RNA sequence: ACCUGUUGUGGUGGAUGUCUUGGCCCAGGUUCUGAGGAAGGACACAGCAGCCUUGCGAUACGUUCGGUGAUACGCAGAUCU
RNA sequence: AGAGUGAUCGAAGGAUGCAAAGAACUCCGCGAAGAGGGUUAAAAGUCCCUGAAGCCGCAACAGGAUCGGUGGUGUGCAGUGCUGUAU
RNA sequence: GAGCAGAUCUUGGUUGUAGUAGCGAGUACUCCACCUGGAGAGGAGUGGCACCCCGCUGUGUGCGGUUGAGGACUGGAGUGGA
RNA sequence: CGGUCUCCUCGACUAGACGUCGCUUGUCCACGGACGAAAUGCAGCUAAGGGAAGUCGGCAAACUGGCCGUGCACCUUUGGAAG
């Protein structure tokens, strides 16, 4: 008693594809379109101009070729999914909140596998003349 | 065990055809028909079964 | 005898076919004919070809508890539909006999439509199924009688 | 059963077994009109029925 | 009139490893035959697809669960070659032993 | 479309009504089996017959003879006035 | 018949028609059927006198959230009969 | 032997459940060909066409059996032979 | 998918009539098909760090595993224990 299962009892069913709002996400970088910059993912330390698309492209996505944002952490949904980004509502006044962020390094290595190299030229210089390159 | 699996060992024949009553009631081991009692000259018949008489009457 | 449950205004403008002890599941033939009821003869035959090819389905409106939902049941404002193959083939034979009867009566069958297609539960034929713990249960075949009238178009 | 009788008779006459008998697929009709061990003998003489060489269990290894 | 309905002859490489991937081992080769049928149907726009017994032999050359990763096929969309009925195109898909699938793109016979 | 209902109709079903070469009951008569082989049980026997028959026994759905007097019959087939 | 090794147990099962006149022939189909066309007083069609209830299909019509029910009550509205009916 | 609503009543016929639960041990099938009333698949698919012919369009991973070509199982305490 | 008497019984690995695979013989028959195939289930496996803290209870699973050489304790009925 009560002689009915309640709404509070965990049952099996649909998991995922719910509408969620992930609040308080800091923007770490706004990079310009790669068609115009060609060096958008270069930072104070990098010596080669590089674009945020990694080696072998983003897995299941491709090249990034528009103005990109670097959100901190994870955002809902898969890739290719449309995320509305609103100005914050649950506003704090920590330094974590009101902190200036400068990116010193952007990892553009291959996410399809384990990428040891941040640049195809780095990969060349490490793995120098191969059979396919010496045949080209 | 008792049922399905011991019903498989049930070959053999306690009774076979009797030559007086042609019924499969003749016990093989003790050569005695279980229905008419063949070896003895009288026919086996008891008053406690009218049906059994009915099935053999003249 | 030979008595259908459909009175036509002019049976000189009709075509009739009947099937008895058809050895098809009734509950599927019922839905088949209920879908086929008002269609023209050409629409009917094309519909049956498509149901066979599984491109569109047969909605299971009444005798369809447990039937699987389909996107092909949107044709009839329903969601549960199937593709009853043996009954589609038997109703194909039924309508083919009715079309032959039309041709015999001297009638364009392509002008007629299906008026009063119908199915009935025939006599059930028993079999034995063998259940746990030494029980026996029946397997009754549930066959059907079929009948169809085609009535020529009125324009 | 299309050529089962002919396969059995041929297995007998060839002393192998129906799984080593080869019935000509391009002579299935004349093979099916066999009807007797004598006609199966004729077919075997004619080449429409063959004793397949025993498979290999080589011992070189 | 459509070229869909004319006799044709393509030589094309089907990649069967996209097909038999994550598939149940005991059913890989049956699935590869069904996929060859669906492939040839999508390509030659026919319903009569006839697989050569030598192409079946090749698909089964690894047994089940050992299907080759790709087969060079020859799709010949053929006239019915004998009938009393209507046109009724059909395609006999056979096997082309190539030993090397390098730069082997689709080809047409007597273009 | 589905459901509920009311009619009409069609199916499934075999209740009803009517009957009956059957039973049950009462009265009368007889009780008449067998080693000369009984009662029962087998296996046989028909042009087409499996079953049944208070049919029959290698003379095998029948043999002699009497009474009757033109059929028998599900098909045929020669005997019969 | 059937069941049990056996001693034993032991059912269900009647009705075409006056007469087989037992459904010729035609169309369609592989065929059964079916549609015609017939026999017959009638299909009474070898399931055969009749064919109830329960249940089911179909068509027509009337409604369709609510134990706000079945049923009762008093009207109403549609459909449907019945009885009487002055000059 | 004279009235049924009941007796876990007797016999018979049924209904929902429900086209539901299921039909999941013994590794496994595939291709061509022939056998078909049909089985590479249509009910008069559709436009000319006035049935022939020429076009277009649709066809369910597809019944059964048997040769042959493959893939596998039994693996001699056998799925063999008595 | 139970039970039911006897006989014959090949090659390779191996101690082998274990177990695994193959010639001879026989068979592909068990209702199937699609969809990578939800949840749950019955089965097969894995799993970091910890290692019975789980539980009535190390239940279940895991560890070990054949052979060769060296070698082996308490206790003992002198045989064993003992692989
Ligand atoms: Zn006796």
């Amino acid at each position: 008693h009560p002689a009915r299962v309640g709404y509070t009892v965990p049952r099996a069913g649909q998991n995922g594809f719910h509408h969620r709002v992930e609040a308080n996400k800091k923007i770490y970088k706004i990079g310009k379109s790669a068609l115009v910059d060609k060096a958008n993912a270069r930072c104070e330390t990098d010596l080669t101009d590089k674009t945020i698309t990694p080696l072998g492209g983003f897995v299941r996505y491709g090249i990034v070729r528009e103005d990109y944002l670097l959100i901190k952490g994870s955002v809902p949904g898969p890739i290719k999914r449309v995320m509305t980004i609103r100005k914050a509502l649950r506003i704090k006044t920590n330094k974590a909140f009101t902190e200036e962020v400068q990116v010193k390094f952007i990892d553009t290595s291959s996410k399809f596998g384990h990428g040891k190299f941040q640049t195809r030229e780095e990969k060349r210089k490490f793995m120098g003349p191969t059979k396919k390159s010496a045949l080209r | 065990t008792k049922g399905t699996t011991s019903f498989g060992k049930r070959n053999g024949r306690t009774h076979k055809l009797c030559k007086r009553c042609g019924k499969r009631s003749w016990a093989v081991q003790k050569k005695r028909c279980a229905a008419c009692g063949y070896p003895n000259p009288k026919m086996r018949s008891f008053n406690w079964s009218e049906k059994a008489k009915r099935r053999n009457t003249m | 005898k030979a008595k259908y449950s459909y009175t036509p205004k002019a049976e000189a403008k009709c075509a009739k076919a009947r099937g008895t002890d058809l050895r098809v599941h009734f509950k599927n033939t019922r839905e088949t004919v209920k879908t086929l009821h008002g269609m023209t003869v050409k629409k009917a035959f094309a519909y049956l070809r498509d149901v066979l090819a599984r491109k569109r389905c047969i909605p299971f409106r009444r005798y369809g508890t447990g039937c699987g939902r389909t996107p092909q049941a949107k044709e009839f404002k329903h969601t549960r539909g199937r593709w009853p193959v043996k009954s589609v083939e038997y109703v194909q034979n039924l309508l083919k006999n009715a079309v032959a009867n039309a041709n015999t009566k001297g009638l364009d069958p392509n002008a007629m439509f299906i008026s009063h297609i119908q199915a009935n539960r025939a006599q059930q034929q028993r079999r034995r199924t063998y259940r746990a713990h030494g029980r026996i249960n029946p397997y009754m075949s549930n066959p059907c009688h079929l009948e169809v009238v085609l009535v020529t178009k009125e324009e | 059963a299309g050529l089962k009788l002919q396969g059995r008779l041929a297995a007998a006459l060839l002393k192998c077994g129906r799984n080593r008998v080869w019935l000509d697929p391009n002579e299935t009709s004349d093979i099916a009109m066999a009807n007797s061990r004598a006609n199966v003998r004729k077919l075997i003489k004619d080449g429409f029925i063959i004793r397949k060489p025993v498979a290999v269990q080589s011992r070189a290894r | 009139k459509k070229a869909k309905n004319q006799p044709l002859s393509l030589e094309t490489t089907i990649n069967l490893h996209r097909v038999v991937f994550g598939c149940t081992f005991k059913r890989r080769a049956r699935k590869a035959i069904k996929a060859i049928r669906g492939f040839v149907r999508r390509v030659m726009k026919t319903h009569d697809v006839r697989i050569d017994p030598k192409l079946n032999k090749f698909v089964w050359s690894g047994g089940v669960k050992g299907v080759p990763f790709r087969a060079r096929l020859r799709l010949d969309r053929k006239r019915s070659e004998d009938e009393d009925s209507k046109k009724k195109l059909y395609t006999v898909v056979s096997w082309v032993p190539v030993h090397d699938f390098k730069n082997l793109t689709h080809k047409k016979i007597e273009e």
Side-chain angles (χ1 to χ4, degrees):
Chain A
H1 276 98
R4 298 158 315 280
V5 184
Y7 73 104
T8 55
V9 180
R11 313 308 298 264
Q14 157 74 24
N15 191 9
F17 205 73
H18 314 298
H19 181 270
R20 298 280 176 268
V21 181
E22 279 300 325
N24 289 339
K25 301 292 176 173
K26 185 75 82 76
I27 288 183
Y28 276 27
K29 190 176 197 282
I30 288 177
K32 284 308 146 290
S33 158
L35 280 70
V36 182
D37 212 335
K38 289 201 170 202
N40 54 34
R42 175 182 185 161
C43 302
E44 294 293 331
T45 64
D46 275 290
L47 322 171
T48 294
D49 295 280
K50 59 154 166 202
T51 59
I52 193 170
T53 176
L55 265 47
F58 278 99
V59 177
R60 289 200 311 291
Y61 183 77
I63 320 298
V64 159
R65 57 175 79 259
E66 282 299 311
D67 316 319
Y68 71 87
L69 264 52
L70 254 49
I71 302 295
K72 187 214 178 188
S74 63
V75 309
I79 60 185
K80 278 184 283 301
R81 169 77 50 88
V82 55
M83 208 57 44
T84 299
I85 38 171
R86 197 202 49 235
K87 294 196 141 36
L89 256 52
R90 185 181 293 237
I91 293 182
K92 312 200 193 193
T93 312
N94 322 324
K95 202 157 307 278
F97 206 91
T98 80
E99 173 183 318
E100 284 193 350
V101 170
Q102 184 79 51
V103 179
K104 316 279 196 307
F105 167 78
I106 300 188
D107 177 280
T108 62
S109 85
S110 178
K111 313 302 175 312
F112 182 78
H114 295 290
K116 284 79 187 173
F117 314 90
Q118 298 298 319
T119 298
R120 300 182 47 181
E121 289 315 300
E122 179 196 348
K123 179 172 159 166
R124 280 170 164 107
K125 198 197 185 68
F126 198 101
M127 294 175 69
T130 64
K131 220 177 75 166
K132 56 162 56 69
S133 284
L135 275 173
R136 162 183 280 94
Chain B
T1 80
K2 303 171 178 180
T4 305
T5 178
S6 293
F7 272 84
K9 310 187 184 53
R10 290 201 197 183
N11 52 341
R13 282 301 177 273
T14 290
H15 299 109
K16 299 193 71 62
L17 284 164
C18 181
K19 60 174 185 178
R20 289 176 71 183
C21 49
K23 281 180 63 67
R24 199 266 297 275
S25 299
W26 180 74
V28 158
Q29 281 187 37
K30 292 211 156 169
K31 306 164 194 56
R32 182 64 57 125
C33 166
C36 74
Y38 151 63
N40 76 329
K42 302 199 163 109
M43 295 287 292
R44 179 181 165 287
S45 69
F46 306 89
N47 291 346
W48 46 251
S49 181
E50 312 176 340
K51 297 205 194 204
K53 309 194 161 200
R54 290 211 297 260
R55 294 157 191 162
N56 321 310
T57 57
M58 42 177 301
Chain C
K1 283 295 187 308
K3 54 178 78 72
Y4 299 178
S5 64
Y6 171 80
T7 79
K9 289 159 49 70
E11 65 271 15
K13 305 196 171 192
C14 290
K16 313 184 312 174
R18 169 186 281 265
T20 49
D21 307 330
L22 283 203
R23 265 43 161 173
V24 223
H25 282 193
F26 167 75
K27 292 195 172 184
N28 307 331
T29 308
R30 186 265 161 189
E31 316 281 340
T32 306
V33 306
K34 182 78 180 205
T35 312
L36 278 175
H37 181 88
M39 308 175 65
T40 59
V41 162
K42 178 166 166 289
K43 274 187 202 71
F45 277 112
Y47 175 56
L48 294 193
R49 270 179 255 123
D50 292 323
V51 173
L52 274 189
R54 271 80 146 165
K55 300 175 70 165
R56 73 176 97 171
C57 80
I58 291 185
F60 273 25
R61 304 158 163 106
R62 169 191 317 213
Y63 294 127
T65 286
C67 168
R69 296 167 174 164
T70 321
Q72 293 162 24
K74 290 174 175 158
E75 199 165 285
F76 319 94
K77 313 306 166 197
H78 212 262
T79 46
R80 308 178 315 197
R82 261 184 205 180
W83 305 262
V85 166
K86 191 180 280 180
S87 47
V88 159
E89 295 280 19
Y90 267 89
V91 181
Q92 274 188 350
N93 295 332
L94 183 76
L95 302 182
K96 285 179 200 147
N97 179 236
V99 162
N101 289 334
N103 272 325
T104 304
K105 272 190 160 196
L107 266 170
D108 178 10
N110 276 268
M112 325 195 78
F113 69 101
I114 298 187
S115 160
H116 177 81
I117 190 146
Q118 191 206 340
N120 282 274
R121 323 206 184 222
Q123 177 187 55
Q124 292 141 20
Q125 304 309 140
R126 297 181 187 89
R127 289 191 306 182
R128 279 196 188 87
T129 200
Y130 289 109
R131 311 316 300 269
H133 303 288
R135 304 186 211 156
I136 306 184
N137 287 171
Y139 272 4
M140 288 187 269
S141 162
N142 287 286
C144 46
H145 323 283
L146 276 172
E147 60 192 42
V148 67
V149 177
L150 321 185
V151 178
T152 202
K153 199 55 57 171
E154 285 303 325
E155 87 266 351
Chain D
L3 299 177
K4 293 235 167 163
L5 168 73
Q6 291 81 14
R8 184 178 63 75
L9 295 201
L13 275 165
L14 283 157
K15 296 182 191 172
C16 54
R18 44 204 66 97
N19 279 80
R20 274 180 67 204
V21 172
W22 178 91
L23 307 171
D24 202 298
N26 296 326
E27 279 302 83
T28 181
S29 298
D30 186 27
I31 296 194
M33 275 81 79
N35 177 268
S36 185
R37 300 166 150 274
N39 312 329
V40 175
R41 284 184 213 136
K42 181 141 202 164
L43 291 168
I44 288 182
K45 282 176 163 175
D46 293 329
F48 309 145
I49 309 177
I50 308 185
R51 203 204 315 111
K52 297 190 294 189
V54 156
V56 170
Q57 203 182 7
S58 172
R59 306 185 56 86
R61 278 178 326 260
Chain E
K1 156 151 280 188
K2 287 174 193 180
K4 181 183 84 66
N5 299 269
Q6 290 284 298
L8 184 71
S9 284
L10 317 163
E11 270 205 17
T12 68
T13 302
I14 178 176
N15 167 250
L16 302 159
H17 178 57
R18 278 157 70 248
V19 167
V20 295
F21 174 95
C23 183
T24 297
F25 280 147
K26 277 192 208 86
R27 308 183 295 208
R28 296 212 162 199
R30 174 183 172 76
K31 184 164 195 160
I33 285 298
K34 296 202 174 202
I36 289 186
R37 272 203 193 95
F39 186 84
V40 179
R41 255 177 193 142
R42 265 161 82 145
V43 184
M44 301 309 252
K45 282 295 146 197
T46 48
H47 177 90
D48 194 0
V49 179
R50 309 178 192 190
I51 297 172
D52 190 288
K54 290 300 156 193
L55 173 66
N56 197 56
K57 177 153 177 35
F58 172 73
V59 169
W60 288 84
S61 50
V64 301
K65 80 172 155 269
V67 193
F69 280 171
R70 61 174 63 166
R72 184 74 155 172
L73 306 178
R74 178 153 175 166
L75 322 182
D76 288 341
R77 193 170 59 209
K78 212 166 214 173
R79 200 177 300 102
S80 178
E81 209 88 344
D82 276 330
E83 277 186 356
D84 300 332
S85 299
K86 304 206 198 183
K87 181 55 186 295
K88 295 308 293 178
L89 275 299
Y90 78 89
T91 174
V92 286
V93 51
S94 65
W95 170 54
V96 178
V98 286
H99 160 268
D100 171 72
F101 289 96
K102 181 181 301 271
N103 298 95
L104 259 182
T105 314
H106 310 289
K107 300 295 181 333
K108 303 184 64 172
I109 289 90
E110 286 170 1
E111 178 66 12

